[PDB]
Amino acid sequence: YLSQPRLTYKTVSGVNGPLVILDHVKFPRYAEIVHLTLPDGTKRSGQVLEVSGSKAVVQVFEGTSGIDAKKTSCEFTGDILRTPVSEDMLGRVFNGSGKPIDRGPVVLAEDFLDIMGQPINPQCRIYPEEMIQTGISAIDGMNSIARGQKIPIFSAAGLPHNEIAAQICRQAGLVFAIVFAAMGVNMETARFFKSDFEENGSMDNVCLFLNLANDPTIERIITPRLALTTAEFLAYQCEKHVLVILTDMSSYAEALREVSAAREEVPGRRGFPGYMYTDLATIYERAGRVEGRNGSITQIPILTMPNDDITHPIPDLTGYITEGQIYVDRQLHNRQIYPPINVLPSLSRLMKSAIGEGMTRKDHADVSNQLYACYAIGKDVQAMKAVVGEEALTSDDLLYLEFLQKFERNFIAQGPYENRTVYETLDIGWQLLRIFPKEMLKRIPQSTLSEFYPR
C-alpha cells in the first residue's frame, strides 16, 4: 500500500507548451501521476516524462493553458498510472481519460492494472490458428483472420472504413466482448458506432472509450492503453474473447509527434519521433492467446494514410508490427464498390496455417492463390489495353479483362448486410475460376482441379 501521505507542491519553475517543469521535488519517480490544480480551481492530471535530480517534467494531458508558476498545485501521487478495471465496464461509455460520460457512476474496481502493459513471455503463447469467419468475402476468402491476429484496416479520409469495421463486429464468429477506442474521431463517427451497437442489441458487450475531435490531444496517448488494459483484463482474467477496435491510429501519432516536438528530441522519419516503432509495438503487440487461458484478443486498428501513401511512416511502421493488413483503396470507392478492398497489397500473415483440410475446406488455399494471380494479371492487361487499344488483344487476354468485371462485382462487392459464409465465398470463387479453361489455372494442382473445377 501507499500509506504515506502525498506531497503537494507549489514549485512550478517553468511551463513550455504541453510541459510543466517542476523543481524541488523530493525523490521523483519516473512515469508518475500528478494532479494539477489551476488557479481558477479546475483539475488536470499529468504524467512525468523525465526526472533529473530534484526536477520533474510533467506531461499534462489536457494541455497547459492557464497554468502559471505561482498558485498551481501539483500533488504527486507517487504511483504509475493504474486504471480501475472490472467486468461491469462492459456496457459503459468512457471518455479518453477513463471518466464516464454515460450519465452513470464511476467504475467500482476489481483490480488496479498498470496501463503501460506488462509483456507476455513468447515461450508460453499459443499460435492463433482458429479462423474467424468475418462474412466479408475479401477479408475472409483471401485475407482470413484468426483469433489473436493484429490486423489493421489501412484506409484514408472519406472511405467507408468505419462501416467496414462495424460490419465485422456484426459478423464476427467462428467457423465475445468488444472494446472500442476512438482517438480524435468526429462526432458523426462516434454517433455511428454507438447507434450500430445500440440497434444490434450487443451494448452489454461493448466498452467504448471515446476521445472526440475536441477532446484534448495528449489524452490520446493513453486512450489505446486504457482500452487494451481492459481487454487484457477481460481476456486473460475473465477468459472472454475480445475484439479491440482502435480507430484512427493516425490520431495517436500526431499527438505523439506533438509531445516530442516541444520536448525537442531527435526527430525521425517525416518529423515523427525516434521511438515510434516500439511505441506502436507497445500497443499492437498486446494481443493473442496464452497457455492455460481460454481467452483471446483480436486486434483491428484503423488507419488513415495521408495522401493515400502506403509508404508514409504510419502504415509502413504498422505493417512491420502487425500480421498482414487490409487495404481500403480510393479507386474502387469511386466506382461504387462496397467494400472497396484492394486485394493486391492486402495480406494475412496468419492465413497460411488457419485454412486448409480439417479447418475450412480442402481447396481454400488453392483458390485464393489463383484468384490472386488472375486479378494481378488482368490489372496489367488493362494497363496494356490503354496503349495498344482494345483491338490488339489475344483471345486468352479478353478472358483476364472478363475476370475483373466479374471479380470486383460478384466477389468483392458485397453490400453491408450480407453474412457470406466461408463456403459461400469459395463457391463464388470457383464460378470465377470457370471463366478460364482448365489449362490456365497454373497455381492449382491436379488433385484439386479434378474434383472442384467441373460443375
Partner: protein
C-alpha cells in the same frame, strides 16, 4: 562499488557517484535489479543504457556495479534453449515463476546449474601437461547428436594439476585447475565471453563447400557457400531457410519481429524431424534460439544479434559447421537509430547514425570457414544469413547500401513486386553472388550439365527485361516470332521456377536434383520451340508462338505442374521418372508440328 540514480529519461538513466566505472560494462539500475550498460562518462557520472523498461525508478535508487561487460554464458545446455537478447532462458522463466509474464529485472541463470552432464576427458592429456587457450580438455554428450567439447577459454594457459574423473557433473563442479607462474586458477564447464568481442582463431581459410538452401532462387541463380554472408514474406523465406539447412548447428535469432510469428517458430521447430544414421531425430537437439519481439525494449533488441553470433562462434570453435539466421537486420538498425536518438547523436542519412556501416560490418565479418584455435586439429565455419527489411519499398535506404559493401551474396525483391506478393523476385540491378566462380568445381562433378543451363536461364531473363520495356511502349508489334517465345519462357520461369510457395508442404524444401530437373525441362522446351519457329520461318507453315499455344496447351500446364512434386512422398528417382516422361511428351509434341 555502488551508485545512485541522478536522472532517467526513457531507457537512458544518468547515475551519480560512479567514478571508476568503465565503458560498456553492466550495472543493476534500480531497486529491482534492471540490467543496463554504460555508454558515457561525464566526470563523476555515467549515462546508462537500460535493457528493461524503466517505469518506476526514482532518483536515489541504487546502481550496483558489476566488473564485467555484456557477456554470455557458453557451456552445456544451450541446445534446444530459447533466449532473449540478454540471454535469459524463456523456458526456465516460464516454470520458475509459474506465470505467463516476464518480470521486470528478473534474475535467473542462463544455463541450469542443477542438471548433471557426463564428463569424458580428451585422452591425450594428463595431470602435468601444458594446456593453452582453445585446447579441448573434456567432451560431454549433451544429447544424442551434439557432443559438447569443453574447451579452455582464450587468454588462458598453464599446466594441468587436477582434471575430473569420468562422472556426472553439474556445471559448477570444478574440473580443471591450471598452474601458471605462481597463481593457480580453478575452472568450470561454463565460460563467459563478451558479446562484442570476436572469439580468437588461428587462421581464416577460403570457403569452398556449397551451403544448400531450400529455395530454387539462391540455389541455382545466386548461390551461397559454407561460410558466406547472404542477405534478403521476407520473414517467411527467412525461417524456411533455417528449417532446411545441411549444417551441424542452427542458430536462429529473431531481432524484433511479430509476436505470433514467434509463436509459429516455437510450434514448428520442436515438431520438425531430421534423419540421422537410420533413426530420425528432432532438430531442436541441435538448434538454439534467440527470441526478441518488437514488444521488448529497444536496447535488448540491439544485443540480440551479438548474442546470436557469439553462440555460433562458440560452436564453431568445437569444429562444427554452424549456420546463423539473422532475421530482420533492418529492425536491428532501427534499434540503433532509436538508441542514438536518445543520446542526441547527429544522424548522417535518414535518421540513421554514421557508424551503421561499422556496426553492420562488425557482424557479418565474423563468418567464414576457419582453422580453429587449439591443438586437436579442428576446422569450423559459420554461415551468416541476413534478412534486410527496407522501409517503404525503396531500395536506397541506408541499411541496404551499407550491406551491399559488406556481404558476398545478395538477392533482393523486385521494385514492382514489393507491395504485391510475387515471391521470390530477383532485382537484377543489385542482386549478385560472388561465389559463382567458386562453385564450378562442385557443379561439374555432381550435376555436370547445370552450368550450361544456368547461363541460358539467365539469358532468357536478362533478355525479357530488355523486351518488357518495349512491349510496354510498342506492344508486341516489333517482335519477330523468335522473340515472342523469350517473352513466354521468362513468363514460365518467373511464375513456376523462381516463384516458390515456401509454406506449402511440397515446396518448403527443393532439393538440387529437382531444381536441375525443373530447369532441364524448360530449357529443353525453349530449344524445341525456337527450332519450331526458325526452321519454318521464311516459307509457309510459319509456326508462330500462337500456333504453339493452341496445340500444346496441355503441355505448358504440365511444365507449370513440375513444381507440385513433393520430394518426400514421391521418390528421388520417381520424380526423375516423371520428368523424363514430360520430355518424351515434349519431344513428341513438336514432331506433330513439323
Amino acid at each position: 562499488t555502488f551508485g545512485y540514480v541522478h536522472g532517467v529519461s526513457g531507457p537512458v538513466v544518468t547515475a551519480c557517484d560512479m567514478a571508476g566505472a568503465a565503458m560498456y560494462e553492466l550495472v543493476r539500475v534500480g531497486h529491482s535489479e534492471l540490467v543496463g550498460e554504460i555508454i558515457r562518462l561525464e566526470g563523476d557520472m555515467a549515462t546508462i543504457q537500460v535493457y528493461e523498461e524503466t517505469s518506476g525508478v526514482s532518483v536515489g535508487d541504487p546502481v550496483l556495479r558489476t566488473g564485467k561487460p555484456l557477456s554470455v554464458e557458453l557451456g552445456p545446455g544451450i541446445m534446444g534453449a530459447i533466449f532473449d537478447g540478454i540471454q535469459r532462458p524463456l523456458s526456465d522463466i516460464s516454470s520458475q515463476t509459474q506465470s505467463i509474464y516476464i518480470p521486470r529485472g528478473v534474475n535467473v541463470s542462463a544455463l541450469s546449474r542443477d542438471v548433471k552432464w557426463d564428463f569424458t576427458p580428451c585422452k591425450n592429456l594428463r595431470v602435468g601437461s601444458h594446456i593453452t587457450g582453445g585446447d579441448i580438455y573434456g567432451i560431454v554428450n549433451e544429447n544424442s547428436l551434439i557432443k559438447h567439447k569443453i574447451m579452455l577459454p582464450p587468454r588462458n594457459r598453464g599446466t594441468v594439476t587436477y582434471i575430473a574423473p569420468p562422472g556426472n557433473y553439474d556445471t559448477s563442479d570444478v574440473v580443471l585447475e591450471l598452474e601458471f607462474e605462481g597463481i593457480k586458477e580453478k575452472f568450470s564447464m561454463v565460460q563467459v565471453w563478451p558479446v562484442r568481442q570476436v572469439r580468437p582463431v588461428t587462421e581464416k581459410l577460403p570457403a569452398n563447400h556449397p551451403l544448400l538452401t531450400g529455395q530454387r532462387v539462391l540455389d541455382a541463380l545466386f548461390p551461397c557457400v559454407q561460410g558466406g554472408t547472404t542477405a534478403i514474406g521476407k520473414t517467411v523465406i527467412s525461417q524456411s531457410l533455417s528449417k532446411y539447412s545441411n549444417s551441424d548447428v542452427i542458430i536462429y535469432v529473431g531481432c524484433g519481429e511479430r509476436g505470433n510469428e514467434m509463436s509459429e517458430v516455437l510450434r514448428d521447430f520442436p515438431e520438425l524431424t531430421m534423419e540421422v544414421d537410420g533413426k530420425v531425430e528432432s532438430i531442436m537437439k541441435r538448434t538454439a534460439l534467440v527470441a526478441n519481439t518488437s514488444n521488448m525494449p529497444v536496447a535488448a533488441r540491439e544485443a540480440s544479434i551479438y548474442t546470436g553470433i557469439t553462440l555460433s562462434e562458440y560452436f564453431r570453435d568445437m569444429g562444427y559447421h554452424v549456420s546463423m539466421m539473422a532475421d530482420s537486420t533492418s529492425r536491428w538498425a532501427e534499434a540503433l537509430r532509436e538508441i542514438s536518438g536518445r543520446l542526441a547523436e547527429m544522424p548522417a542519412d535518414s535518421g540513421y547514425p554514421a557508424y551503421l556501416g561499422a556496426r553492420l560490418a562488425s557482424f557479418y565479418e565474423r563468418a567464414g570457414r576457419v582453422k580453429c584455435l587449439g591443438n586437436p586439429e579442428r576446422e569450423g565455419s559459420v554461415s551468416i544469413v541476413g534478412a534486410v527489411s527496407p522501409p517503404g519499398g525503396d531500395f536506397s535506404d541506408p541499411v541496404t547500401s551499407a550491406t551491399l559493401g559488406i556481404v558476398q551474396v545478395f538477392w533482393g525483391l523486385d521494385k514492382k513486386l514489393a507491395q504485391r506478393k510475387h515471391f521470390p523476385s530477383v532485382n537484377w540491378l543489385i542482386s549478385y553472388s560472388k561465389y559463382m566462380r567458386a562453385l564450378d568445381e562442385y557443379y561439374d562433378k555432381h550435376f555436370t550439365e547445370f552450368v550450361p543451363l544456368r547461363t541460358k536461364a539467365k539469358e532468357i531473363l536478362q533478355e525479357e527485361e530488355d523486351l518488357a520495356e518495349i512491349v510496354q511502349l510498342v506492344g508486341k508489334a516489333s517482335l519477330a516470332e523468335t522473340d515472342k517465345i523469350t517473352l513466354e519462357v521468362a513468363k514460365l520461369i518467373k511464375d513456376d521456377f523462381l516463384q516458390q510457395n515456401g509454406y506449402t508442404p511440397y515446396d518448403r524444401f527443393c532439393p538440387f536434383y529437382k531444381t536441375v530437373g525443373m530447369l532441364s525441362n524448360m530449357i529443353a522446351f525453349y530449344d524445341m520451340a525456337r527450332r519450331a519457329v526458325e526452321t519454318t520461318a521464311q516459307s509457309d507453315n510459319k509456326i508462330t508462338w500462337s500456333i504453339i499455344r493452341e496445340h500444346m496447351g496441355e503441355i505448358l500446364y504440365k511444365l507449370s505442374s513440375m513444381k507440385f512434386k513433393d520430394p518426400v512422398k514421391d521418390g528421388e528417382a520417381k520424380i526423375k521418372a516423371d520428368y523424363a516422361q514430360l520430355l518424351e511428351d515434349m519431344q513428341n509434341a513438336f514432331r506433330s508440328l513439323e
